[model samples]
Target: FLTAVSSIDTFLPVLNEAKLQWPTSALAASSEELLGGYVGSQFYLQDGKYMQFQIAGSSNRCELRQMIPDGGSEIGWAVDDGTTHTATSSIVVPEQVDGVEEVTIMQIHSGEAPQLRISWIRSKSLDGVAYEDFIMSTVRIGTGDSSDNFVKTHLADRTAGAMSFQIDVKDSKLTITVNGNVVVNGQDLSFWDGTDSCYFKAGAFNNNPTSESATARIKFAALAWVDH
Candidate 1:
């Protein structure tokens, strides 16, 4: 149940979950892309058991979604975080793919896009899109929108290797820092409106993918998150 206010314990990733999807047709995706058990085939993600934890957000309808960064562009795992996360896979997106705009590694939203979202963007690929924007060429942190976030590309290359990404949302202040660099300086969470609670989501969330012509792949050495 989404806050409308929890009747019990608060300050955690309550009612959290996950799902899987893959392109089966034009703008269509099927979860059967994998073996449909403990591992996947095409997605190549093999996660362990889901870890239980509680996190906080605004009093609004904060939801979680582990995506392929499709931004609803494709028909991949385009579902919300309501299905009791039945599987966990080591997200491994291979290179050579195209059309990926924002490889959203992880995102916790107070509501949805254009709302307050704390994202751990590993890479912002411009494979099958336009050029010119230097900011889109590196790993970026999305703290809701372009107004709040960080870009490590200008300072360093974040396409691969180990890097530290951290975030903390306590009341009105939302802080995001990657590799010790403060990207979002105590952002105002109230701007999210309703001040809704948030949730956890990860995996390949692509935004610019329209078809095979624009696709993307991403890999992570490790990933971890929690409540503050």
Candidate 2:
């Protein structure tokens, strides 16, 4: 039950997923697999395993992932109006690489700044000492000016492998859980009063680039979202 599918069309229905967005500027105009999930072996699907969401280090955009609503006259939601929005998924973070440390795996896509970003931050060099164990970063809430304006937390030792995570928002509060552990509980989220029509995005969005063909490979065992 673990084999690469010939096409994304065959793997999409398994999870009822989203419309993909790739590093279009990095691909040639003659490339036929732009939306086909094969960006020079950057993105692909494996049965019973994961969907590899990848991006080249030199790509124009910093993302390679899926956007919900499929962009077909679909209206996003407003969190300022008591909407309960949630997303749950399992992902494996790519191992730490020099000059490339962070890649967001899940996010709430607002206008220019995402409302939320959950990322895997690999070990950083501190006084020439690179520590072991990865860090999972979370922005408790989103603000109008900057997404990183809210209170943030980092969980250490979240090494690269398949891990489950959930982000839930309800009544101006946020709760985040990773690998069955509650990392953020009831954090205030009223700062997003002016943000609306926001949607959800899942997959790998790079935060840093490297000259050495760096890539972020994420395998999503489960990807789901709900609004009420």
Candidate 3:
């Protein structure tokens, strides 16, 4: 049985425990502060509180992804929220794009290929799926020596409120469900080679300008995780 107190304390804003990392610090080939990603001050996750994310101006910004200093490849995630705004434009420049408010609630960085990603996009459809809002997509890379060793499966029409995902690295499987309905199911994810790490990085990670800087937020009623 899982003991409550014996299990120790756990909570949101788990960046520290989660050991969150991104590409913001790295300089692009052009020698620019890869100006993409989660603004530390924009994420809020605490006890009995609603998690929210906000971004002002960022270009080449990145999504939130993490690695377990310890070691593990299997994890499960879920979230409940309302007003999640994805970026339609990075910045209002018409010509030279600057940045947008924000977008995307959850993004997972896996080993090499077969990476799981979740985002709210203002698009008509992604991969022939009908979606006016967002889609849950997983990119899996097959074979490591080829130039093009990848495949992506995305289910369109996902939203901001009530989002969930799970990855089975050992089984080589990945799945995304919304409100308990399995939308996207991918197999042959067998990408875990037992020498890497896997983790979940919460909050909003926005891309660069041109689309008009935007905003992305997630409010979890009760966020929890399980590892087996």
Candidate 4:
């Protein structure tokens, strides 16, 4: 399991000066959206990866933003219907099996047509090795169009981790589990198929570019082949 801690200087300055004390512990800190300015922090994970930066906020809405490993950045936001609430996000540590790496997650959005986007570096060498696999699954729930109607689309694919994609749909309240984990709750989405091509843009539907303004919280882990 990967654990991370933030230094005092990088912690949200506003909360640090607030009369109402807030917990500094990462476990106690619920992923919240910023309002006007950027909330900055530094995090050192148990695995030795460290990141420090600030996130922008919105007054009309909330969003989650993060820098990709070798890419520009990413933004996750709630749908504009305006009834969203109490959304939760989590990531499954990446694991290796038979020299292949996998990333997993558990997510929940509180509104209809809720969606999420993940940005990653697309590997160029597809000669004979299948280096990466992105998999997802969800349980069916809700009344409108089935979650299966939503499509996964690619926004970009470049060498410096410049690929972006999203999973979105309109459904009802229900929990959908992926890979024995509840990846999405209170909405329905689709599952990723292993047969899909890895190096190509097979996973993406239409070329929908990554959103410039959005909010999201994600927990993700990566694994690499020992021999590669």
lDDT of 3 by residue, 1-228 (tens): 211111222232232223332334232111011111222434433232343444444532333333222333233322111111111111111111133322444554544432454544444443566554444453545546453454444544444344444433334455555555666554444544342344554444554433544443444343333344
Query: Which candidate achieves the best lDDT against the true structure?
Result: 2
Q: What is the TM-score of each candidate against the true structure?
A: 0.46, 0.73, 0.55, 0.26
Give the CA lDDT, 0 to 100, for residue 220 in model 4.
24
lDDT of 2: 0.60
What lDDT is obtained when candidate 4 is compared to the true structure?
0.25
Better of 1 and 2 by lDDT: 2
Candidate 2 TM-score, true structure as reference: 0.73
**Pairs in steric clash, model 2:** none
Task: State the lDDT of candidate 4 residue by residue for 1-228, as single tens digits.
Answer: 223322222323222211110111112123232212223332223233222111122211112222112222222322222233221222332222221111112223332322332322122123244433443332323324654444332222212221222232222233333333444444432322211111100111111113323222222222110000
Candidate 1 vs candidate 2: the TM-score winner is 2
lDDT of each: 0.34, 0.60, 0.38, 0.25
List runs of model 4 lying over 4 Å from the truth.
Answer: 1-4, 8-78, 81-108, 111-114, 117-148, 155-228
Q: What TM value does model 4 have?
A: 0.26
- Once superposed on the true structure, which residue ranges of model 1 sit more than 4 Å away at CA? 1-37, 42-96, 112-157, 210-213
Residues 17-122 of candidate 1 have per-residue lDDT tens digits of: 2333233212212222211222222333222322111111111111234332313211122112223212111223333233333344445443444322222233
